[PDB]
PDB file of C-alpha atoms and ligand atoms in Angstrom:
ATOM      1  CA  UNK Z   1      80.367 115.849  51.807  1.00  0.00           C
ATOM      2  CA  UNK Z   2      82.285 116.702  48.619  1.00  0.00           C
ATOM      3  CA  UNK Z   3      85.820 115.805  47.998  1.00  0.00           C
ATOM      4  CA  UNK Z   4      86.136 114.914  52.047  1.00  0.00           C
ATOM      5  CA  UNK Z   5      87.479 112.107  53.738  1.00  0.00           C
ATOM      6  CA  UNK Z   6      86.147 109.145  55.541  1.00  0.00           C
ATOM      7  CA  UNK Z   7      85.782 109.889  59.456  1.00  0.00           C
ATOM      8  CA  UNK Z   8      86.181 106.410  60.668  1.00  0.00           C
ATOM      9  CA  UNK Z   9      83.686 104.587  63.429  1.00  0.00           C
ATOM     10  CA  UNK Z  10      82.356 106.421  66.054  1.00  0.00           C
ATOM     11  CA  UNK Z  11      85.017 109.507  65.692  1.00  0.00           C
ATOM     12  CA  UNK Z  12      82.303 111.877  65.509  1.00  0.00           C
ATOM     13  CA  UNK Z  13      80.348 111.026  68.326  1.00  0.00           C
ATOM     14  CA  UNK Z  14      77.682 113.641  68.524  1.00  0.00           C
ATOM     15  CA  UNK Z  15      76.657 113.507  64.740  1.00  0.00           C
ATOM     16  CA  UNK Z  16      72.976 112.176  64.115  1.00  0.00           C
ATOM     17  CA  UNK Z  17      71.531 111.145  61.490  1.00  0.00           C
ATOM     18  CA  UNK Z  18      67.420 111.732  61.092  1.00  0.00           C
ATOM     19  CA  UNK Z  19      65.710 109.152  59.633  1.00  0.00           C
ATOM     20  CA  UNK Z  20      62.071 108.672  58.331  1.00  0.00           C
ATOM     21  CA  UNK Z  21      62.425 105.203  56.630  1.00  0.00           C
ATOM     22  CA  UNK Z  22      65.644 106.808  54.938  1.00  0.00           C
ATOM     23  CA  UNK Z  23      68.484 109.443  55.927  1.00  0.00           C
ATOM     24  CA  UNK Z  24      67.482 112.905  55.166  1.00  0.00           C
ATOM     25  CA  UNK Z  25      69.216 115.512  57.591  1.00  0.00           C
ATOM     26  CA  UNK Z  26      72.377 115.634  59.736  1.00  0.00           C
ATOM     27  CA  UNK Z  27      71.804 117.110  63.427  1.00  0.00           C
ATOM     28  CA  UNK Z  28      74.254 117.542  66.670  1.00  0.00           C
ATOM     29  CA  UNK Z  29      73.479 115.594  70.284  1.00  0.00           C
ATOM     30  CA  UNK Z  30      73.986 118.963  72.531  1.00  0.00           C
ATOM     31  CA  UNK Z  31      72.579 117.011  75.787  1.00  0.00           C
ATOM     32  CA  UNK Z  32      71.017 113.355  76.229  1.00  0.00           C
ATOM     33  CA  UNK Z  33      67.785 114.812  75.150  1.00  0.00           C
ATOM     34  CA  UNK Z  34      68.428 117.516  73.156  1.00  0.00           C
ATOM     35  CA  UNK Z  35      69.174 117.756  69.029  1.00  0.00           C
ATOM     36  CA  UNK Z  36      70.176 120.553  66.860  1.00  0.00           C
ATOM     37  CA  UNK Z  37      69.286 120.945  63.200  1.00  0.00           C
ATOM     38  CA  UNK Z  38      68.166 123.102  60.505  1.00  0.00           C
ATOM     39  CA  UNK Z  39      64.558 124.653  60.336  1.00  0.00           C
ATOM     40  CA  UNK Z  40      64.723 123.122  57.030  1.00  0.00           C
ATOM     41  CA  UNK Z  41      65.105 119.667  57.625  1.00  0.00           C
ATOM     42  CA  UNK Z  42      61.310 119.667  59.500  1.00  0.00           C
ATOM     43  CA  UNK Z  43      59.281 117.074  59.368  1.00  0.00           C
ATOM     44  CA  UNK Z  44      56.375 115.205  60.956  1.00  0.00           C
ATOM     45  CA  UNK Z  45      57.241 111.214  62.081  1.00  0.00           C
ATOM     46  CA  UNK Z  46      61.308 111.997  62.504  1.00  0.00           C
ATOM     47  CA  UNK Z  47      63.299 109.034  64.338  1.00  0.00           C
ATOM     48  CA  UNK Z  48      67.194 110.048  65.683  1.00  0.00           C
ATOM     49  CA  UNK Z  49      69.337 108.127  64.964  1.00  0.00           C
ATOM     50  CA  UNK Z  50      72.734 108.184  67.345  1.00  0.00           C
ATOM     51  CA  UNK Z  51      75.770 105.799  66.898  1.00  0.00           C
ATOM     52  CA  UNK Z  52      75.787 105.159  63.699  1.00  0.00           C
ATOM     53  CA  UNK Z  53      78.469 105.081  61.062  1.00  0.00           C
ATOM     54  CA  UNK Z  54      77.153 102.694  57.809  1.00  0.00           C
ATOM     55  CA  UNK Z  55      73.516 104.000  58.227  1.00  0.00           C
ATOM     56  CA  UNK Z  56      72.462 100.870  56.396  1.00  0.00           C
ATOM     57  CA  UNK Z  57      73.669  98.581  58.610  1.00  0.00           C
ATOM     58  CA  UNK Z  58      73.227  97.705  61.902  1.00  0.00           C
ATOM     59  CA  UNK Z  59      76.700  97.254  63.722  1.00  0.00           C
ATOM     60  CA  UNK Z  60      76.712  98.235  66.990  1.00  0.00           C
ATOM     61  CA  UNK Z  61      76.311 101.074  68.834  1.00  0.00           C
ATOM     62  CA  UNK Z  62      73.787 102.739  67.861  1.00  0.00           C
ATOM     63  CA  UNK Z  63      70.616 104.049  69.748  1.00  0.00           C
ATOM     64  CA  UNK Z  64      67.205 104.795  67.738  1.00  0.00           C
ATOM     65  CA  UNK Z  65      64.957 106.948  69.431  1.00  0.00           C
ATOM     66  CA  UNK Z  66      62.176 109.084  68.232  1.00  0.00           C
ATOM     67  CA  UNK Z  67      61.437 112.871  68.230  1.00  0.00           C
ATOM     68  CA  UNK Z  68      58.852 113.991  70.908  1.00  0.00           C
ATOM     69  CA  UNK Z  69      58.887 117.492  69.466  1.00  0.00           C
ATOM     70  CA  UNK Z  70      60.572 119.552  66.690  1.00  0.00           C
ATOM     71  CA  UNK Z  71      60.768 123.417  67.781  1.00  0.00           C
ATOM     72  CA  UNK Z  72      61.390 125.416  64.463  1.00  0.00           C
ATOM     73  CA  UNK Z  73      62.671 128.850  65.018  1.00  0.00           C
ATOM     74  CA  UNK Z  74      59.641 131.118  65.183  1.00  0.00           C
ATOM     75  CA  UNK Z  75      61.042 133.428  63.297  1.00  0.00           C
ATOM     76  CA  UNK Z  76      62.586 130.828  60.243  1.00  0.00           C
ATOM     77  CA  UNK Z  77      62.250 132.506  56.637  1.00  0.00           C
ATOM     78  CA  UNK Z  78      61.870 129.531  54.581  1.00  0.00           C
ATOM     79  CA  UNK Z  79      62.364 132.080  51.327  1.00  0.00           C
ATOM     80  CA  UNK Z  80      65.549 133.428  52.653  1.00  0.00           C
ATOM     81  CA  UNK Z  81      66.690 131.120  55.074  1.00  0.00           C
ATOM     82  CA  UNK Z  82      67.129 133.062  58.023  1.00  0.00           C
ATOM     83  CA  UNK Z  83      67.102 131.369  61.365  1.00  0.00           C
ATOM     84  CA  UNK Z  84      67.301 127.958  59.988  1.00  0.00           C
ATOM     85  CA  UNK Z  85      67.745 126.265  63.559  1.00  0.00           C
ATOM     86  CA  UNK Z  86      65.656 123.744  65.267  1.00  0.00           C
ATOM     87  CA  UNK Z  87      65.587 121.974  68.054  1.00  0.00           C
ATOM     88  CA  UNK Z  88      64.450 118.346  68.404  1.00  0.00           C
ATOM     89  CA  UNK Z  89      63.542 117.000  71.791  1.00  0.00           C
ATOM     90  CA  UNK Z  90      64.172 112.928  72.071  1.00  0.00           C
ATOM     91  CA  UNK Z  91      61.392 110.606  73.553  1.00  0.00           C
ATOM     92  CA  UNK Z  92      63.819 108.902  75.761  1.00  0.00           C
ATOM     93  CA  UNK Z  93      67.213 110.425  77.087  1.00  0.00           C
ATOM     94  CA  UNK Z  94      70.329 108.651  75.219  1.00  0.00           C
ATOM     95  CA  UNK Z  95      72.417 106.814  76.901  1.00  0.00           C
ATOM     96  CA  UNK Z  96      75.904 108.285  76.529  1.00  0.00           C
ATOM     97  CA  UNK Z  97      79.587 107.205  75.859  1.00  0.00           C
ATOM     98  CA  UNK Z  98      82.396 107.224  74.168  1.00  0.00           C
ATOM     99  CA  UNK Z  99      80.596 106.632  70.842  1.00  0.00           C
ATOM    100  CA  UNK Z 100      77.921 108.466  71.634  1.00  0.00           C
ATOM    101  CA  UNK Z 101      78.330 112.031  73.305  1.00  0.00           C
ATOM    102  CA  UNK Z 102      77.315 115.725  73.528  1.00  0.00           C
ATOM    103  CA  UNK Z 103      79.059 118.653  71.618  1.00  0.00           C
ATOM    104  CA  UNK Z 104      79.070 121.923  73.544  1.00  0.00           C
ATOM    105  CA  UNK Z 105      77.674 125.443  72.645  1.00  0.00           C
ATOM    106  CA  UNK Z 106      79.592 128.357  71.724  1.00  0.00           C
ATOM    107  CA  UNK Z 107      80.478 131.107  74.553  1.00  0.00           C
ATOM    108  CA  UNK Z 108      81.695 133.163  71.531  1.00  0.00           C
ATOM    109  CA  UNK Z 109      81.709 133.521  67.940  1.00  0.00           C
ATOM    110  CA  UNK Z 110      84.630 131.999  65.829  1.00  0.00           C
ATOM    111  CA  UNK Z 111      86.425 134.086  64.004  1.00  0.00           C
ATOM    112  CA  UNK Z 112      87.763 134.204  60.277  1.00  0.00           C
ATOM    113  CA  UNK Z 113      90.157 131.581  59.656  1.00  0.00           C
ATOM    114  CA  UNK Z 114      89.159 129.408  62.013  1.00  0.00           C
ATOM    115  CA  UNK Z 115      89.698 125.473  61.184  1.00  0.00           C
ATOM    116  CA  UNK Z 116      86.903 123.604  61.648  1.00  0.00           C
ATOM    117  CA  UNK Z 117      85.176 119.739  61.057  1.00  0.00           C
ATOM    118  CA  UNK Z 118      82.198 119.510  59.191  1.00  0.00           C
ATOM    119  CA  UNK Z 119      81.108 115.970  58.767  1.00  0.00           C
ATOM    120  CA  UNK Z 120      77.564 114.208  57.285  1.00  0.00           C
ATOM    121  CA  UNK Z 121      75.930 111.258  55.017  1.00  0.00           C
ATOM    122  CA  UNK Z 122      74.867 113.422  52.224  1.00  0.00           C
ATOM    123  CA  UNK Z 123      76.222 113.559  48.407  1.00  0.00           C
ATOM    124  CA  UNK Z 124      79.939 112.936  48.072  1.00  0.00           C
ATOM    125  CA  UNK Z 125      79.805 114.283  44.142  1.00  0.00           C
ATOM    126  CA  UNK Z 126      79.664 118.266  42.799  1.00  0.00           C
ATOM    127  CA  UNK Z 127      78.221 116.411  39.375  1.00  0.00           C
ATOM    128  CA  UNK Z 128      75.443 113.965  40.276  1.00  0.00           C
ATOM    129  CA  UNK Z 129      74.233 111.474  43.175  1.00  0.00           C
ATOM    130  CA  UNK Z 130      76.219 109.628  45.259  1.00  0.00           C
ATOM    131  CA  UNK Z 131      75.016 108.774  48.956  1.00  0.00           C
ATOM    132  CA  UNK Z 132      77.746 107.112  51.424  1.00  0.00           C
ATOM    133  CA  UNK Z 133      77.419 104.314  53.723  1.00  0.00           C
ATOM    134  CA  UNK Z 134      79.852 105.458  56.107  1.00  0.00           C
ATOM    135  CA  UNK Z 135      80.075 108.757  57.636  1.00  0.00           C
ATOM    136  CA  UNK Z 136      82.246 111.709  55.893  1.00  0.00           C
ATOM    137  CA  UNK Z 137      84.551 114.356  57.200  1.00  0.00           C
ATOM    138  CA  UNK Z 138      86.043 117.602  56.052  1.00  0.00           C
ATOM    139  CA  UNK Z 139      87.745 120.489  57.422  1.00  0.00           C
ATOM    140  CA  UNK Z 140      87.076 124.371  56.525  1.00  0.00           C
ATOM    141  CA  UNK Z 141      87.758 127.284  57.361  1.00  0.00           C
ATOM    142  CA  UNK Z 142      85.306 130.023  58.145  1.00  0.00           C
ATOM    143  CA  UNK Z 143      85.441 132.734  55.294  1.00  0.00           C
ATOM    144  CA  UNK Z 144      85.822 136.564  55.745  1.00  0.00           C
ATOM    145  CA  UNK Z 145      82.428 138.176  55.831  1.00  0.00           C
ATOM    146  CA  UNK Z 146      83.293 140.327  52.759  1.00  0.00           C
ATOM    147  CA  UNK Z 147      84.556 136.770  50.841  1.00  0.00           C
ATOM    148  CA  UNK Z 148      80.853 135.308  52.100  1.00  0.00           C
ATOM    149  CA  UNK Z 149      78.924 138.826  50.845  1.00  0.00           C
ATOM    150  CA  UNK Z 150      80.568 139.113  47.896  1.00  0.00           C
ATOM    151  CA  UNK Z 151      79.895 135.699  46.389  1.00  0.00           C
ATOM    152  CA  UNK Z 152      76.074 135.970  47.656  1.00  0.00           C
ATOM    153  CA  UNK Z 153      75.016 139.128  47.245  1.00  0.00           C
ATOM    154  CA  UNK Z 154      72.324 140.175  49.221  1.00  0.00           C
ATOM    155  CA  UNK Z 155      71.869 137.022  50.239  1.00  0.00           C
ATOM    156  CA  UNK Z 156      74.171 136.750  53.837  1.00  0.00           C
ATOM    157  CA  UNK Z 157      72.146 137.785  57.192  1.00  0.00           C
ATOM    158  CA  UNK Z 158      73.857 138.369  60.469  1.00  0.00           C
ATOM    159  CA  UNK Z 159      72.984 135.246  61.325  1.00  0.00           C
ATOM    160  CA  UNK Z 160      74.866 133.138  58.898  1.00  0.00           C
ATOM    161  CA  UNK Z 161      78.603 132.395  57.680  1.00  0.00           C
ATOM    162  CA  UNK Z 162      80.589 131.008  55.118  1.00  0.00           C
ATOM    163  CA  UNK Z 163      83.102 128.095  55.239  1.00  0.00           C
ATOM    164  CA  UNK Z 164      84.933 126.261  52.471  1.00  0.00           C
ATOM    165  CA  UNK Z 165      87.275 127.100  49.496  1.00  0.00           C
ATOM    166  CA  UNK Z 166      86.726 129.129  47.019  1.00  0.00           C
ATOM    167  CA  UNK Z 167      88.443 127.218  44.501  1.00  0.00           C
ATOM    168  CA  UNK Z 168      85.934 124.342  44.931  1.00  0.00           C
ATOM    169  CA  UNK Z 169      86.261 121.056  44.910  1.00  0.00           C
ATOM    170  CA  UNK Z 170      85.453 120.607  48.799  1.00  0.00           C
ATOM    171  CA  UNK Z 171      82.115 121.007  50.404  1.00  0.00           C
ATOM    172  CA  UNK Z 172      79.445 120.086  52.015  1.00  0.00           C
ATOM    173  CA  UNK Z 173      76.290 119.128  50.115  1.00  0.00           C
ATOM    174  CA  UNK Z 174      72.401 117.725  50.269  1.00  0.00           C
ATOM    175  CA  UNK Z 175      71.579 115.206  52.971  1.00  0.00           C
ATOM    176  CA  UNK Z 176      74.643 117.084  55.076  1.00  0.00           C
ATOM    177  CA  UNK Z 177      72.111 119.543  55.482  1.00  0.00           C
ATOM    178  CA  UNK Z 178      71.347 120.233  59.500  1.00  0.00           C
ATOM    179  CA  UNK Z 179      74.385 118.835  60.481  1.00  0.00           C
ATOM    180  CA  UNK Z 180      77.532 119.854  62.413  1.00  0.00           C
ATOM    181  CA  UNK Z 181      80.154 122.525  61.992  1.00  0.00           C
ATOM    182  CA  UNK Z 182      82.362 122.191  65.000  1.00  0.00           C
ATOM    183  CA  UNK Z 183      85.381 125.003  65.923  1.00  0.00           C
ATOM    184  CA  UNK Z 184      87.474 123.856  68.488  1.00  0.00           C
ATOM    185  CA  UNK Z 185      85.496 121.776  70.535  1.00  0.00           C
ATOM    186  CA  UNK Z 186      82.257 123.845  70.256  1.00  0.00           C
ATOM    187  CA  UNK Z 187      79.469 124.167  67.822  1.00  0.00           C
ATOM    188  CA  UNK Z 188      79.403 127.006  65.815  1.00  0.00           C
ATOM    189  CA  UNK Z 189      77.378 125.818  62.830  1.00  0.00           C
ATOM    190  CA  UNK Z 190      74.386 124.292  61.377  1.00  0.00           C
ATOM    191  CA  UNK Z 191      74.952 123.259  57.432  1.00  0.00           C
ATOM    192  CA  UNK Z 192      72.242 124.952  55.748  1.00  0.00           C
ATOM    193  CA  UNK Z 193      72.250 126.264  52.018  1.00  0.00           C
ATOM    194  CA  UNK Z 194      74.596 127.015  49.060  1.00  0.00           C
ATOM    195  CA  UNK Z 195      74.197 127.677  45.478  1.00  0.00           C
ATOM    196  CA  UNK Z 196      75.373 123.436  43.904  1.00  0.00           C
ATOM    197  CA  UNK Z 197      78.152 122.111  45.847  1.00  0.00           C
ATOM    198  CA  UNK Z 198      81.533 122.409  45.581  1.00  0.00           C
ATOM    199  CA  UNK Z 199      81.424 125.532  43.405  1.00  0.00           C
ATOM    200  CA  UNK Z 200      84.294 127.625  42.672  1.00  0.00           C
ATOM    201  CA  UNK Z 201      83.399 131.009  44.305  1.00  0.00           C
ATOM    202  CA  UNK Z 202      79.955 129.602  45.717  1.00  0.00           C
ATOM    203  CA  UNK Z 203      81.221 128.172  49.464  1.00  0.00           C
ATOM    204  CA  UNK Z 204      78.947 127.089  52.061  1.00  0.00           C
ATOM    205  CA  UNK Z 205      76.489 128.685  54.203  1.00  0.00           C
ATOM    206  CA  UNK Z 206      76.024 128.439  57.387  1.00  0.00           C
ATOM    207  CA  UNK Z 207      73.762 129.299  60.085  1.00  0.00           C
ATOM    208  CA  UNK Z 208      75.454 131.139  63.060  1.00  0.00           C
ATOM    209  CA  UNK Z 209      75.241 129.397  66.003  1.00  0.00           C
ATOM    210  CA  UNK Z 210      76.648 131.547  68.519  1.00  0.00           C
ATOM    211  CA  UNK Z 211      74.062 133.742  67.672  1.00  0.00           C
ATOM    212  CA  UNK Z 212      71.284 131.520  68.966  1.00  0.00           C
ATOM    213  CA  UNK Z 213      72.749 130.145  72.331  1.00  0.00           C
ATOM    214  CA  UNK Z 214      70.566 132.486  74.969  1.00  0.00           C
ATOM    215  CA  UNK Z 215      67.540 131.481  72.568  1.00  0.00           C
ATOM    216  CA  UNK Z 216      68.336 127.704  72.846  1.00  0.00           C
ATOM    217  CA  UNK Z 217      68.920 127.935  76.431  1.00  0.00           C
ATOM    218  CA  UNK Z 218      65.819 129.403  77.407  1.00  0.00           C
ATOM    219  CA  UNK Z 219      63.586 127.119  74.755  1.00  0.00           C
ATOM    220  CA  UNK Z 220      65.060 123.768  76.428  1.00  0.00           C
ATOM    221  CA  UNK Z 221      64.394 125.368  80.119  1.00  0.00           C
ATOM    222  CA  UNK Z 222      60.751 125.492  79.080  1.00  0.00           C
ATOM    223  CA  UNK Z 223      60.291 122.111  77.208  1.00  0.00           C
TER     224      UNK Z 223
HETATM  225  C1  LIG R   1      69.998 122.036  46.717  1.00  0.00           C
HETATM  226  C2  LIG R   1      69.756 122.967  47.902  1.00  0.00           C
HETATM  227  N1  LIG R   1      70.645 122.622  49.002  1.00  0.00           N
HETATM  228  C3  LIG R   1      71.890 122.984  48.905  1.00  0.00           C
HETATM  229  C4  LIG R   1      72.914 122.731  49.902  1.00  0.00           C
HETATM  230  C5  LIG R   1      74.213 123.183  49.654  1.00  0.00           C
HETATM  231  C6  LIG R   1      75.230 122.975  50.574  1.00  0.00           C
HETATM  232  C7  LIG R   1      76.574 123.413  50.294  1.00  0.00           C
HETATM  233  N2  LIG R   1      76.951 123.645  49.045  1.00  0.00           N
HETATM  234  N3  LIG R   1      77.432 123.582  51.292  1.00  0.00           N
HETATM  235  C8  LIG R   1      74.947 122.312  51.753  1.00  0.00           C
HETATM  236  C9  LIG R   1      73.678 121.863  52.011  1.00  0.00           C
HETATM  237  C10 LIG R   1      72.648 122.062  51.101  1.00  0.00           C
HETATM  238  O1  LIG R   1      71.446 121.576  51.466  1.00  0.00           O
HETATM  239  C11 LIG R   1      68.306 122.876  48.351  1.00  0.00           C
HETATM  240  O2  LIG R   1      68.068 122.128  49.373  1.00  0.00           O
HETATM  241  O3  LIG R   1      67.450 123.507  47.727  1.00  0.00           O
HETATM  242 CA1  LIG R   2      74.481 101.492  61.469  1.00  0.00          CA
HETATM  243 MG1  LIG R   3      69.652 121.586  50.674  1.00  0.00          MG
END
């Protein structure tokens, strides 16, 4: 997360972070065995992480528990992006409370304007590397869909969104990637792709969640 703020302990409580012997994706806890990510962030040997806030440090709270299976979207474009959703089913069912907790799926599609929290462990500078200990927080708005076409041309399917500022200088980033984009109280968005981060005129991408809730519904009735 660029230019963003830090969260504080356990304020996020369904964040996860995925971890192969280091942090490399953000996900959502949608049920106590259920994950959501991005298609992207696949990968064989994946451990979930819940709880956690310094993901180098073991303080308290957290719960490590390994993948069973990762369902990429059959129809994920890894050239384009589309459908970059996946859902990770946990070994063991977490145990939940207050610091750790479920998020809950859309019913509807946000609108333009809408406030949301985007939050994640991946780089905290537009110029360089700079992975954070502790959990980071931001809050965007979701673009107009002419805003989002016109700075990606071609680019923007009907299953993705922009969020951000257009002035730059706030953003998500790499290693935020398959996290959380929550409107409200409900989940609305996967982070996904953008051109840098923290661009002026290049915001955020999205993938749309809303458009995906029937689909993730019927996948976890069958797993
Ligand atoms: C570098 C490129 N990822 C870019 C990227 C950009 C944003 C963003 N600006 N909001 C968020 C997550 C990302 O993973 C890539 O993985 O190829
Ligand atoms: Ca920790
Ligand atoms: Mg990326």
């Amino acid at each position: 997360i660029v230019g963003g703020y830090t969260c504080g302990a356990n304020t996020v409580p369904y964040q996860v972070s995925l971890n192969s012997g280091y942090h490399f994706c953000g996900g959502s806890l949608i049920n106590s065995q259920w994950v959501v990510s991005a298609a992207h962030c696949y990968k064989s040997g994946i451990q979930v992480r819940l709880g956690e806030d310094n993901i180098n440090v073991v303080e308290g709270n957290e719960q490590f528990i390994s993948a069973s299976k990762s369902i990429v979207h059959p129809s994920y474009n890894s050239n384009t992006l589309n459908n970059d959703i996946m859902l990770i089913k946990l070994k063991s069912a977490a145990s939940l409370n207050s610091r750790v907790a479920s998020i809950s799926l859309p019913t509807s599609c946000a609108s333009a304007g809408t406030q949301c929290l985007i939050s994640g462990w991946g780089n905290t500078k537009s110029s360089g590397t700079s992975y954070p200990d502790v959990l980071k927080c931001l809050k965007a708005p979701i673009l107009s869909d002419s805003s989002c076409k016109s700075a990606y041309p071609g680019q923007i399917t009907s299953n993705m969104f922009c969020a951000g500022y257009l002035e730059g200088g706030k953003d998500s980033c790499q290693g935020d990637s398959g996290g959380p984009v929550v409107c409200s109280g409900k989940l609305q968005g996967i982070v996904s792709w953008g051109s840098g981060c923290a661009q002026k005129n290049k915001p955020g991408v999205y993938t749309k969640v809303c458009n995906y809730v029937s689909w993730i519904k019927q996948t976890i009735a069958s797993n």
